[PDB]
RNA sequence: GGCUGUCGUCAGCUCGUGUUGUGAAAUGUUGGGUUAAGUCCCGCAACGAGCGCAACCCUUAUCCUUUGUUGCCAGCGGUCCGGCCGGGAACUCAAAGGAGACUGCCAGUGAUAAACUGGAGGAAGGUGGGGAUGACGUCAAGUCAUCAUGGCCCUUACGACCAGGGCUACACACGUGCUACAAUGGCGCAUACAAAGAGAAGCGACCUCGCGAGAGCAAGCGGACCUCAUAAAGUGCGUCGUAGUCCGGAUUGGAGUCUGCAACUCGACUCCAUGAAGUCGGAAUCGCUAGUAAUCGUGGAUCAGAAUGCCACGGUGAAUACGU
């Protein structure tokens, strides 16, 4: 707001802003605080085994809805749910959101 | 109204007349057949002029001191397009958008201090 | 109505160019109003001698120059036949500005 | 240092800097031959270490007879090692 | 060595100059000779002065030389008598009352000349240099100046072979003009050959 | 490729049906120079009778018999690599390929305008001159000289 | 030391953390497109960063803010018909500052993505056209003969001043460019044909002769004001129709002009004589990507003086790039 706008240049500044817009869009929520998550709610295991492996290495419990054909060893809170039926996963995320919203008493 | 205008190409300085009538054409004390008909410069020095109003239809008492043969052609084109503004005051946009007042790239590029042609290896390719 | 963006070059040239630039533009008929007292002014290219961290010093070349106020209305043929045929005043630039 | 040793051309075209600028117009008869000054014009033979004909592209850095320009006395071949100094108006290396 | 001197490249930037001005076309030789004489003869006798920087400028038949010192103790000397003597010497050489000015400087951390001199002295002290190199780098980083590079020549011990090391750490954008980078190489005549040390400091931005 | 397609149909010349004259300059069209050649052919042939001593009616194609090639270079992929393999000159490239390289060296070779170049360079063929004839002397290098490998 | 050539304006060289492997190591930087590309984006156990590239630098492709002296002379007075004076600074030209090209947009190909393509907008379509920017390295590369520089000699000296020559001399060969080998040219006649530059120790306006060289006289300027400077290949006019040629100009004298005290070896330039080899050049080979080749000259720096070298400017002006 101070230097990039018009202090030095605009065309180069415009190109720089256009390039950095995608970076700004990325990390929308994780950029709020210092991170250090205490849990995770990944929607899949085989597709996103990297997150589960990282959590296991760091000892972070994972409440993942493991797929019927994924590896349940990584997830300590395996939930025999489903990955298709977008309505079902929407209902699950809505339910967990409702529970966490009132979880602070 | 008397449509006068200079125009140039490569730092030329011409005196371009455009008025109704005046069939005689004096292009820097030359002859019509010597620079615009039945000779080497019959049409090459008027290629852009084909698109614009024909030269024969408009008198040209031009003392063009500047530019090559194609340089003279471009200077005449620039002079006429910048001189008939009185004839059509709106051409400042029309001709602007018609690519007629623009300094055509069909010329030796303006250069800093540089090579013989400033775009390629000169005729001493040996290194 | 007449402003001049004088380009200063040196002191030896300016010493005579302060007046000799237009001294030959008026003999008997020109409308020039003569020299003006012209208090001290600093006019030169948009270049500084040595810009440093101190942004208040704004060091610049000091040259004594005088802007032209010709404002002729009806010069005679002979009075201005040599308006620019001057043998002195190395630095000349009559940059009138409406 | 070596600057003084290789300053042979420094003192050869310096004394006459302003010896003719204001004299040629007034003394054009002497300056221009009215032909033949076979004697007066030959007096330059006596000085064998400094004369207008002895100009040899003054270069105190190396003393060679190369590398001078009356307009500004700027490098023309040393630019290869001083191309970033900005002292190259008019004449520059021919690659473009 | 395809590199170029950053100071020469910084001629068109606000950083101090060494020889640049506009004047008459018939006074180049004498002016250049006077500038060379004052520059050469104003630093040879300043071995113990440890002056941070002396700059001579001749914009238009005017001298505005500026002097910045590093350590007041090593430059005051005998109540500044040597300073007055040098001022008189330069004034009589130039023939005009030069407006000499002295500006105090401190914090001998980000100064390229001082760190280079310290490195050369330590090398001449017959002690290890890599530890000194790392110490200088970390000291420079501690006091700001996010970006620094160092380099030393070879000729170690009784070996004719030479090696070059940099151990760069930080930002040293030489190619970009807007970097206000500082550099001043130094040399030391050790027991075997001469060892040269180069330092580049990137002290922030404009 | 399994099948091959022939040349694209092109209308003839209403004036005299001179395909050679049309192909001389059409392939070389640039900067809208077609009008120059169109206005120059008639003007040149009007005075060429005295300019060169012959009229461009029957002598315009009397020194071009050797132009017609018998073997032409064709980039054919055989043995896993490109090769010439000079085959009989098919109508697709027998004349078009040779015609496209005639004004490639007689374009601005000593005149400020193409007013007299095009006509004169071809009229000079009657006096053991020109360049369109010698062009055929280069194709023989790769033909009838490497029959062992071709 | 510094600098330069070399791969090489090539797309490159590494690191921090993380991950895989007992480990050396690998990934990042292996893939797709842009492709000039570690530029960019996408996918991706990788994420980011430090150097290189791109743009950030200069010029140019349009217009605008500001502006007219000498330069242009739209309009006004005649025209000292060249626009000369005022005058307009519309405006050619010029600059103190900008925008306009930035995948910006329509549609399609393409994994929807990236990217590409067809189209449109605009002077400028996929860095709009050129440059400054040469990495880790690299070769005991070259440079101590540009300078400095460790070591190796000596200072009545392999130190130097002066006076002739030599780097251009020949017995030949090689590398480069120029001249040509012409009639797409040569002759004289009429004809409008540039710019960047350079210059009070200078060009030298003009005036007289020299076939000319240039000399006797000479304003001008501190240079948008005075000179180089007229342009050339070109066209119409008569010419030879390929003539060892009016081509080509070396080449062996004279008459001579100037630069320089003095120029055969080692100055330039002009006229007469010189009309040779060479009539497009084998084995072959090299340079060429749009103003490209191809050319035509113009000058500037170098200049006591001595370009076919080098630098700089214009005049004109095509095809080949399907393809790995």
Residue B23, Cβ neighbours under 10 Å: how many?
A: 7
**Would you call C34 helix, strand, or coil by DSSP?**
coil
Which DSSP state fits B109?
A: P
Distance of CA F74 to the CA centre of its chain: 17
D94 domain-assigned:
no
Candidate from B113, B115, B118 with C-beta closest to D90:
B113
**Vertex F96, ends F63 and F147: CA angle to 5°?**
85
Q: Are B3 and B87 in contact (CB under 8 A)?
A: yes
| Side-chain-facing half-sphere of D38: CA atoms under 13 Å | 0
C61 with E57: Cβ contact below 8 A = no
Nearest to C48 by CA among E14, E35, E62: E14
Q: How many domains does chain F have?
A: 1
The residue assigned the tokens 């030069």 is: E98
F62 domain-assigned:
yes
Domain end, chosen from E77, E106, E135, is at: E106
**B with D: 3 or more CB pairs under 8 Å?**
yes
- Domain range for residue F141? 19-146
The answer to whether B110 contacts chain D (CB < 8 Å) is no
What are the phi and psi torsion angles at B92 (to 5°)?
Answer: -55, -25
Q: Are C16 and C71 in contact (CB under 8 A)?
A: no
Q: Are F70 and F89 in contact (CB under 8 A)?
A: yes
- Domain range for residue C95? 1-98
Question: What is the rounded distance in angstroms from the CA atom of residue F94 to the CA atom of residue F88?
Answer: 9
Going F126 to F132 to F133 to F134, the CA torsion angle's sign is: positive
E151 domain-assigned:
yes
Q: Are E130 and E138 in contact (CB under 8 A)?
A: no
HEC assignment per residue over F90-121? CHHHHCHHHHCCCCCCCCCCCCCCCCCHHHHH
Dihedral angle computed from the Cα positions of residues C13, C18, C19 and C20, in that order, rounded to the nearest 10 degrees: 20
Candidate from F31, F112, F115 with C-beta closest to B42:
F115
Task: Name the token pair of D56.
Answer: 């040899």
Q: b/e per residue, F122-133, with b = 16+ CB within 10 A?
A: bbebeeeebbbb
Question: What is the rounded distance in angstroms from the CA atom of residue C22 to the CA atom of residue B127?
Answer: 55
Question: What is the rounded distance in angstroms from the CA atom of residue D75 to the CA atom of residue C37?
Answer: 45
- Bridge partners for E180 per DSSP: none
Q: Are E110 and E62 in contact (CB under 8 A)?
A: no
E133 domain-assigned:
yes
Question: What is the rounded distance in angstroms from the CA atom of residue D49 to the CA atom of residue D65?
Answer: 15
Nearest to A58 by CA among A30, A89, A35, A78: A35
Task: Name the token pair of E182.
Answer: 């500082």
Dihedral angle computed from the Cα positions of residues E6, E8, E14 and E17, in that order, rounded to the nearest 10 degrees: 130
- Domain range for residue A1? 1-27
As a rounded value in angstroms, the CA-to-C1' distance for B78 and G25 is: 70
F4 domain-assigned:
no
Q: Strand E66-69 relative to strand E51-55: parallel, antiparallel, unpaired?
A: antiparallel
Nearest to E35 by CA among E59, E15, E12, E14: E59
Task: Name the token pair of D50.
Answer: 């400094």
Q: How many domains does chain C have?
A: 1
Task: Name the token pair of E12.
Answer: 């068109």
- Bridge partners for B61 per DSSP: B26
Residue B47, Cβ neighbours under 10 Å: how many?
A: 18
E8 with D82: Cβ contact below 8 A = yes
Contacts (Cβ under 8 Å, ≥6 apart) of E121: E188
E195 domain-assigned:
yes
Question: What is the rounded distance in angstroms from the CA atom of residue F145 to the CA atom of residue F150?
Answer: 9
Question: What is the rounded distance in angstroms from the CA atom of residue E65 to the CA atom of residue E99?
Answer: 7
The residue assigned the tokens 């117009």 is: D25
As a rounded value in angstroms, the CA-to-C1' distance for F140 and G283 is: 17
The residue assigned the tokens 């060893």 is: A73
Supply the DSSP string of chain F, one letter for each residue: ------PPP----TTT--HHHHHHHHTT--TTTHHHHHHHHHHHHHHHHHHTSS-TTTGGGSS-GGGS-SEE---EEETTEEE---EE--HHHHSHHHHTTSTTSSSSSS-SSTTTHHHHHHHGGGGT--STTGGGGTGGGGSSS-TT--
Q: How far is CA A8 from CA A5, E11, E14, F40, in A?
A: 8, 21, 17, 58
Nearest to D7 by CA among D45, D79, D57: D57
As a rounded value in angstroms, the CA-to-C1' distance for E167 and G16 is: 15
Q: How many domains does chain D have?
A: 1
Nearest to F118 by CA among F19, F38, F5: F38
D91 domain-assigned:
no
D18 domain-assigned:
yes
Task: Name the token pair of A105.
Answer: 């008493």
**Would you call E51 helix, strand, or coil by DSSP?**
strand
Q: Are F69 and F98 in contact (CB under 8 A)?
A: yes
Question: What is the rounded distance in angstroms from the CA atom of residue C13 to the CA atom of residue E60?
Answer: 13
- Domain range for residue D48? 1-86
Q: Strand B61-62 relative to strand B26-27: parallel, antiparallel, unpaired?
A: parallel
Q: CATH number of the domain that F50 lies in?
A: 1.10.455.10
Give the burial class of F39: count Cβ atoms within 10 A of its Cβ; 0-12 exposed, 13-18 middle, 19 or more buried. middle
The answer to whether C51 contacts chain E (CB < 8 Å) is yes
Question: What is the rounded distance in angstroms from the CA atom of residue E145 to the CA atom of residue E168?
Answer: 13
Task: Name the token pair of A30.
Answer: 């994780």
Q: Are F39 and F114 in contact (CB under 8 A)?
A: no
Nearest to B99 by CA among B43, B52, B45: B52
Q: Are A52 and A78 in contact (CB under 8 A)?
A: no
Domain end, chosen from E79, E106, E133, is at: E106
Question: What is the rounded distance in angstroms from the CA atom of residue B124 to the CA atom of residue F99?
Answer: 33
Longest pairwise C-alpha distance within chain C: 55
HEC assignment per residue over B25-66? CEECCCCHHHHCCCCCCCCHHHHHHHHCCCCCCCCCEECCEC
Helix axis angle for E81-94 and E28-41, nearest 10°, is 160
Q: Which nucleotide is nearest to F107 (CA to C1')?
A: G318
Which DSSP state fits D43?
A: G
Nearest to C83 by CA among C68, C98, C97: C68
Q: Identify how the structure was determined.
A: cryo-EM
Asked if E114 and E203 sit in the same domain, the reply is yes
What are the phi and psi torsion angles at F137 (to 5°)?
Answer: -75, -10
Asked if E27 and E50 sit in the same domain, the reply is yes
Q: b/e per residue, A8-30, with b = 16+ CB within 10 A?
A: eeeeeeeeeeeeeeeeeeeeeee
Helix axis angle for F34-51 and F19-26, nearest 10°, is 130
- C 51-80 residues, CB < 7 A, strand G: 71-75, 77, 80
Resolution in A: 2.4
Q: Are E100 and E38 in contact (CB under 8 A)?
A: no
| DSSP H/E element including A20 | helix A11-25
Residue D61, Cβ neighbours under 10 Å: how many?
A: 12
- Domain range for residue E137? 107-206
E7 domain-assigned:
no
Q: Strand F87-88 relative to strand F71-72: parallel, antiparallel, unpaired?
A: antiparallel
Nearest to C45 by CA among C89, C95, C82, C98: C95
| DSSP H/E element including B97 | helix B91-97
Asked if E117 and E182 sit in the same domain, the reply is yes
The answer to whether D43 contacts chain E (CB < 8 Å) is no
Going B98 to B102 to B107 to B112, the CA torsion angle's sign is: negative
- Bridge partners for E159 per DSSP: none
Q: b/e per residue, B55-68, with b = 16+ CB within 10 A?
A: beebbbbbebebbb
D95 domain-assigned:
no
Q: How many domains does chain E have?
A: 2
Q: Where are the alpha helices (DSSP H) in chain D?
A: 28-31
Residue E36, Cβ neighbours under 10 Å: how many?
A: 14
Domain end, chosen from E106, E135, E160, is at: E106
Question: What is the rounded distance in angstroms from the CA atom of residue D13 to the CA atom of residue D51?
Answer: 7
Nearest to D93 by CA among B89, B113, B72, F138: B113
> Chain G bases under 7 Å from protein CB?
1-6, 8, 18-20, 40-42, 45, 50-56, 58-63, 66-76, 80, 82-83, 85-87, 89-93, 96-97, 99-100, 102, 104, 122-124, 129-138, 146-150, 163, 175-178, 183-185, 191-202, 204, 215-223, 225, 231-236, 241-242, 258-261, 286-295, 297, 300-304, 309-319, 322-323
Asked if E111 and E203 sit in the same domain, the reply is yes
Going F42 to F46 to F49 to F52, the CA torsion angle's sign is: negative
Question: What is the rounded distance in angstroms from the CA atom of residue B23 to the CA atom of residue F2?
Answer: 66
Nearest to E51 by CA among E69, E74, E71: E69
């Amino acid at each position: 707001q101070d230097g990039t706008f018009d202090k030095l240049t605009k065309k180069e500044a415009l190109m720089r802003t256009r390039e950095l817009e995608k970076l700004e869009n990325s990390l929308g929520g994780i950029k709020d605080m210092g991170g250090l998550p205490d849990a995770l709610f990944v929607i899949d295991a085989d597709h996103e085994h990297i997150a589960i492996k990282e959590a296991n290495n760091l000892g972070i419990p994972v409440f993942a809805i493991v797929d019927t054909n994924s590896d349940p060893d990584g997830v300590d809170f395996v939930i025999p749910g489903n990955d298709d039926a977008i309505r079902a996963v929407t209902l699950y995320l809505g339910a967990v959101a409702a529970t966490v919203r009132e979880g602070r008493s | 109204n008397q449509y006068y205008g200079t125009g140039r190409r490569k730092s030329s300085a011409a005196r371009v007349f455009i008025k109704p009538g005046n069939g005689k054409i004096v292009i820097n004390q030359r002859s019509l057949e010597q620079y615009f008909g039945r000779e080497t410069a019959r049409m090459v020095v008027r290629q852009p002029l084909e698109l614009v109003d024909m030269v024969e239809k408009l008198d040209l008492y031009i003392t063009v001191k500047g530019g090559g043969i194609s340089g003279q052609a471009g200077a005449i084109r620039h002079g006429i397009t910048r001189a008939l503004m009185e004839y059509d005051e709106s051409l400042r946009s029309e001709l602007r958008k018609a690519g007629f007042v623009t300094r055509d790239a069909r010329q030796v590029e303006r250069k800093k201090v540089g090579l013989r042609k400033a775009r390629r290896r000169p005729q001493f390719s040996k290194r | 109505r007449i402003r001049i963006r004088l380009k200063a070059f040196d002191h030896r040239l300016i010493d005579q160019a302060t007046a000799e630039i237009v001294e030959t533009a008026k003999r008997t008929g020109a409308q020039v109003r003569g020299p003006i007292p012209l208090p001290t002014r600093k006019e030169r290219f948009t270049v500084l001698i040595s810009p440093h961290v101190n942004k208040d010093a704004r060091d610049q070349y000091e040259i004594r120059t005088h802007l032209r106020l010709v404002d002729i209305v009806e010069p005679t043929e002979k009075t201005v036949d040599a308006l620019m045929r001057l043998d002195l005043a190395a630095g000349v630039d009559v940059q009138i500005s409406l | 240092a070596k600057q003084s040793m290789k300053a042979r051309e420094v003192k050869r075209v310096a004394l006459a800097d302003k010896y003719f600028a204001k004299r040629a117009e007034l003394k054009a008869i002497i300056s221009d031959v009215n032909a033949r000054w076979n004697a007066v014009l030959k007096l330059q033979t006596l000085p064998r270490d400094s004369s207008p004909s002895r100009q040899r592209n003054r270069c105190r850095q190396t003393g060679r007879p190369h590398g001078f320009l009356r307009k500004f006395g700027l490098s023309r071949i040393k630019v290869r090692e001083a191309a970033m100094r900005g002292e190259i108006p008019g004449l520059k290396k021919a690659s473009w | 060595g395809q590199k170029v001197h950053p100071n020469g490249i910084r001629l068109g930037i606000v950083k101090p100059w060494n020889s640049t001005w506009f004047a008459n076309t018939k006074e180049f030789a004498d002016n250049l000779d006077s500038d060379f004489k004052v520059r050469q003869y104003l630093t040879k006798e300043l071995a113990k002065a440890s002056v941070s920087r002396i700059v001579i400028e001749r914009p238009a038949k005017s001298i505005r030389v500026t002097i910045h010192t590093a350590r007041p103790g090593i430059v005051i000397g005998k109540k500044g008598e040597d300073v007055e003597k040098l001022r008189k010497v330069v004034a009589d050489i130039a023939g005009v009352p030069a407006q000499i000015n002295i500006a105090e400087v401190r914090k001998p951390e980000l100064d390229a000349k001082l760190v280079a001199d310290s490195i050369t002295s330590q090398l001449e002290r017959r002690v290890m240099f890599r530890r000194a190199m790392k110490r200088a780098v970390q000291n420079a980083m501690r006091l700001g100046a996010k970006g620094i590079k160092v380099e030393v020549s070879g000729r170690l011990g009784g070996a004719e072979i030479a090696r070059t090391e940099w151990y760069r750490e930080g930002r040293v954008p030489l190619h970009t003009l807007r970097a206000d980078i500082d550099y001043n190489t130094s040399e030391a005549h050790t027991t075997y050959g001469v060892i040269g040390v180069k330092v580049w400091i990137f002290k922030g931005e404009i | 490729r399994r099948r091959v397609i022939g040349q694209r149909k092109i209308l003839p010349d209403p004036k005299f049906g001179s395909e050679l004259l049309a192909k001389f300059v059409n392939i070389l069209m640039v900067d809208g120079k077609k009008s120059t050649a169109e206005s120059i052919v008639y003007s040149a042939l009007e005075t060429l009778a005295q300019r060169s001593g012959k009229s461009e009616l029957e002598a315009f194609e009397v020194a071009l018999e050797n132009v017609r090639p018998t073997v032409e270079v064709k980039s054919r992929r055989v043995g896993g690599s490109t090769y010439q393999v000079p085959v009989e000159v098919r109508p697709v490239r027998r004349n078009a390929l040779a015609m496209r390289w005639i004004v490639e060296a007689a374009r601005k070779r000593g005149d400020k305008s193409m007013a007299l170049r095009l006509a004169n360079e071809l009229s000079d063929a009657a006096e053991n001159k020109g360049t369109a004839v010698k062009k055929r002397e280069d194709v023989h290098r790769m033909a009838e000289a490497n029959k062992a490998f071709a």
